[PDB]
């Protein structure tokens, strides 16, 4: 490690080799504007915002990608720098459609914050913006080309982080635009509905498919009763919308606010989640005792199973036949609650507040229906629920707390930890150990693989006669790596591999509220969300295990008999088919 000495603006510093002047000034309490810069993701120098005077330099240099050097002098407040920033913002703003009353981003468009910050009132230079081509055809992602700034963040994210890379650049000059391949639509190619591309864009050129009109139409029907259900991870970040500090639980406030909307029933996805935990435990027991297809993987997140269908069909024996916890609880409410309440199943409308955006495509699937009836009707993301609350506009900061409904709102901590990565797998191994060997484990040690961060390996003795190999995976690149190893066959001994496309778990999902870059250089939002969720876990004083909850025991005794029954297979078990690829 080499030590570099540099002198800026009255202060000298020693830094390691590879240091950039930007985060060096950040550490030394100086801020420089950023558009195209992301920490360790997009470092190319296309933004052309961050100019600083360099001693001995013919012209200005961009501080974003500028490596430090020894003995240099840097001054950041010359008149040339200010004039260059003003003129360059005037140039770049002549393309972005200036009707900022109606952008979804609106208040936190980083371009708008820069525009106000530089105080550049006038725009002397006119122009002819590029062609307006609204791609309002796909299922989840909507693109608008009248806004895009060629920041290149979206393409870098979809190339590196997700290892999919269905976006590229075409043309030259004004003809240069970001497009999918073959001039098709997003849904016509192998897009995974990752949600990272829509969350990382600093302008609002991308938006999600809005179904709030359908929601208002559904709630407007007196003949239709509404069943709303909640994720464990909605209270992980929603408080950030209302100016609350990171890590606030508003669960009772959320229930009260949803009741003020006039929803007939409020409920949690937790109960069916415990049901499917019992499920995967049951076919674990079966595949152990019958030599089932191994290694086993879950079927929780729609995104990566979509990826497996699209790209690697050869692992289709390895998937779990179970349907998603969303799908489990949706079918459960549409059947058992309907039987108890003696109401026509078409007379219920079920709405879900989930953070994945891939569920928008997942609900559109033909085969996720029971008895020809829709298990769930409308799925919505956290951001658009927030805007629904804002258009209703109840002062959220003074709500009291409320409880959930019988029976399917009850909670357990091992099912609270669904929000973080591997909590599903933790609950599964804890429950199967409790069932088979009466073993009381709370946490599992994880082996961090050298050179790859985000992949986690574990192996704990479930029974003295059977030690189960455990692998955790989040991040599309990690999925690609572990799938390549699985095709190579070196994971033959492995038993469970848990996968989601979105890195860091659902707290880092596509439906989570938008955050800027500044807080990302400060604090990992994943870390604070995980701490808040784990603190919520430690406070669950009713049950830390799913199989001990009296509600799931009641349902199993009365209506579900045992898992892997013919009724259980017919209602909760499904098959998947490979999808045609257009790549």
């Amino acid at each position: 490690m080499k030590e570099i000495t540099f002198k800026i603006n009255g202060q000298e510093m020693i830094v390691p080799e590879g240091t950039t002047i930007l985060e060096a000034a950040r550490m030394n309490n100086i801020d420089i504007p950023t558009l195209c810069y992301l920490k360790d993701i997009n470092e190319i120098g296309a933004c052309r915002m961050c100019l600083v005077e360099i001693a001995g330099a013919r012209a200005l240099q961009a501080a974003c990608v500028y490596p430090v050097a020894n003995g240099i002098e840097v001054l950041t407040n010359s008149p040339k720098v200010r004039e260059a920033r003003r003129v360059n913002l005037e140039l770049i703003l002549s393309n972005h459609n200036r009707e900022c009353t109606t952008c979804i981003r609106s208040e936190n468009c980083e371009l708008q914050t820069l525009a106000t910050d530089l105080g550049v009132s006038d725009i002397p230079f006119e122009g002819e913006k590029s062609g307006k081509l609204i791609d309002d055809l796909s299922t989840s992602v909507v693109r608008d080309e009248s806004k895009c700034i060629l920041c290149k963040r979206c393409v870098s994210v979809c190339r590196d982080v997700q290892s999919v890379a269905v976006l590229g650049t075409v043309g030259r000059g004004f003809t240069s635009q970001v497009q999918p391949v073959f001039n098709k639509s997003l849904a016509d190619v192998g897009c995974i509905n990752c949600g990272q591309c829509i969350i990382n864009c600093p302008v609002g050129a991308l938006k999600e498919k809005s179904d709030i009109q359908r929601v208002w139409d559904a709630i407007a029907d007196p003949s239709k009763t509404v069943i709303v259900q909640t994720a464990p991870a909605v209270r992980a970040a929603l408080g950030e919308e209302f100016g609350y500090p990171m890590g606030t639980s508003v669960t009772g406030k959320m229930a009260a606010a949803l009741r003020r909307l006039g929803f007939d029933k409020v409920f949690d996805t937790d109960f069916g989640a415990d049901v499917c935990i019992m499920e995967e435990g049951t076919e674990l027991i079966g595949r152990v005792t019958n030599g089932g297809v191994l290694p086993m993987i879950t079927s929780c997140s729609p995104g990566w199973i979509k990826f497996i269908e699209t790209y690697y069909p050869e692992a289709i024996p390895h998937l779990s036949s179970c349907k998603s916890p969303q799908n489990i609880t949706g079918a459960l409410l549409k059947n058992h609650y309907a039987q108890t309440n003696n109401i026509d199943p078409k007379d219920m409308v079920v709405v879900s507040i989930m953070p994945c955006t891939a569920k928008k495509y997942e609900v559109q699937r033909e085969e996720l229906c029971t008895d020809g009836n829709a298990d769930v009707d409308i799925s919505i993301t956290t951001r658009e629920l927030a805007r629904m609350i804002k258009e209703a506009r109840i002062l959220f900061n003074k709500l009291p707390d409320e409880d959930f409904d019988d029976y399917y709102g009850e909670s357990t901590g091992a099912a609270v930890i669904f929000g973080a990565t591997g909590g599903v797998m933790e609950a599964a191994v804890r429950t199967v150990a409790d069932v088979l060997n009466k073993k009381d484990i709370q946490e599992i040690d994880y082996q961090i693989v050298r050179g790859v961060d985000g992949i986690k390996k574990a192996s704990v003795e479930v029974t003295p006669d059977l030690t189960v190999n455990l692998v955790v995976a989040h991040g599309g690149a990690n999925i690609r790596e572990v799938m390549e190893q699985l095709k190579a066959g070196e994971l033959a001994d492995t038993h469970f591999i848990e996968l989601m496309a979105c890195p860091g778990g659902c707290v880092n999902g596509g439906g989570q509220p938008i955050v800027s870059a500044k807080d990302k250089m400060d604090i990992d939002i994943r870390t604070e969300r995980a701490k808040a969720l784990y603190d919520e876990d430690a406070n669950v004083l009713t049950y830390r295990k799913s199989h001990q909850n009296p509600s799931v025991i009641r349902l199993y005794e009365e209506y579900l008999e045992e898992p892997n029954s013919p009724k259980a297979h017919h209602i909760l078990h499904t098959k998947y088919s490979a999808k045609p690829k257009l790549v």
Partner: protein, 129 residues
Amino acid sequence: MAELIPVENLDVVKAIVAEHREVPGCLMQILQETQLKYGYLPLELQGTIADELGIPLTEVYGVATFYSQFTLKPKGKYKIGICLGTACYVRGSQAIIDKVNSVLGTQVGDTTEDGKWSVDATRCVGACG
């Protein structure tokens, strides 16, 4: 002049891939070589070549579009390129451009429906003397 290979014949494409796989930075070279053999390169050629390489279509399609000298649509029998160089410009080349537009009955950058005449704005061929 060797006959252009029909674009539906894909064994030649993968033969080219196999013989020039080992070469570093082979994308541009293979692209221009298939341009030479096939005459024009439709979209399924990017699809097939990227499937053989196993690397996504985005960069291949981009470098196909980023080089203006690479063609995606069928052209005419004869291409007419008029020198838009400065030495040709100062002589008054716009008069020649308008005369070509008048006689050809076709605008700049379009191929005649007969598939015989095409016009291009080559900036220089180098014979500025």
